[PDB]
C-alpha cells in the first residue's frame, strides 16, 4: 500500500508513535518519507553485505527481522521479514519501536541524519489533524 501523507500521520498517532522514546510524530513521518515514500512493500537489497531493507521504515534483516538468507543475522523484533511487507503496519510499527529502544534511537537510520535531523520537519504533519 502507498499511504497518503495525512492518512499515515493519523495512523501512526493511533499506534502510539508520537513521542515514543522522545521521538515526535513529524520525525517518524520524515523517516517513512525518505526511506520508502510511504510504501509498505518497498524492499532494497544491499549487495554490499547481503542484507535486505523491508517495508515502510526499511527495517534491516541483519538485526531486526528473519529472512533466512542474511548471514550472521539476528531477529530482535521476532518477526519474519514478510510481516514488514503487509498493508497493515501494526507489526512494522512494533518493530520500529524496538529499533529505537537501542541507544542510537532514531539515529539508527542514516537517512534520518541526512534528511530530517536539525530540519524544520513540521511540513510532514501540517494540516493532518494530529
Ligand atoms: Na535477521
> How many distinct structural domains can be found in the chain?
1
Residues 6+ apart with CB under 8 A from 61: 51, 52, 53, 54, 67, 70, 73, 81
The region, left, alpha or beta by phi > 0 then psi within -120 to 50, assigned to residue 124 is alpha
Range of the domain at 11: 1-130
Nearby residues for ligand 1 (ion, Cβ within 5 Å):
61, 66, 73, 75
CATH number, domain containing residue 90? 1.10.530.10
Elucidated via: X-ray
Instruction: Say how many Å lie between the CA of residue 19 and the centre of ligand 1.
Output: 27
Active site residue 49: no
Active site residue 120: no
CA 52 remoteness from chain centre: 14
Q: Phi/psi of residue 71, each to 5°?
A: -65, 135
Task: Please give the grid coordinates belonging to residue 36.
Answer: 520508502
Report in angstroms the alpha-carbon separations of 51 from 19, 47, 94, 117.
29, 7, 21, 25
Q: How many CB atoms lie within 10 A of CB 53?
A: 21
Catalytic one of 4, 53, 67, 120 = 53
State the DSSP string of the chain.
-B--HHHHHHHHHHTT-TTBTTB-HHHHHHHHHHHHSSBTT-EEEETTTTEEEETTTTEETTTT-B-S-STT---TT--BGGGGGSSS-HHHHHHHHHHHTSTTGGGGSHHHHHHTTTS--GGGTTTS--
C-beta separation of 63 from 77 below 8 A: no
Amino acid at each position: 500500500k502507498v499511504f497518503e501523507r495525512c492518512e499515515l500521520a493519523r495512523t501512526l498517532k493511533r499506534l502510539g508513535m508520537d513521542g515514543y522514546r522522545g521521538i515526535s510524530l513529524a520525525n517518524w513521518m520524515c523517516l517513512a518519507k525518505w526511506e520508502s515514500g510511504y510504501n509498505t512493500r518497498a524492499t532494497n537489497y544491499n549487495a554490499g553485505d547481503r542484507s535486505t531493507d523491508y517495508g515502510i521504515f526499511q527495517i534491516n534483516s541483519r538485526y531486526w527481522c528473519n529472512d533466512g538468507k542474511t548471514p550472521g543475522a539476528v531477529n530482535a523484533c521476532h518477526l519474519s521479514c514478510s510481516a514488514l511487507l503487509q498493508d497493515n503496519i501494526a507489526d512494522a510499527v512494533a518493530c520500529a519501536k524496538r529499533v529505537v529502544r537501542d541507544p542510537q534511537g532514531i539515529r539508527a537510520w542514516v537517512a534520518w541524519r541526512n534528511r530530517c535531523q536539525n530540519r524544520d520537519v513540521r511540513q510532514y504533519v501540517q494540516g493532518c489533524g494530529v
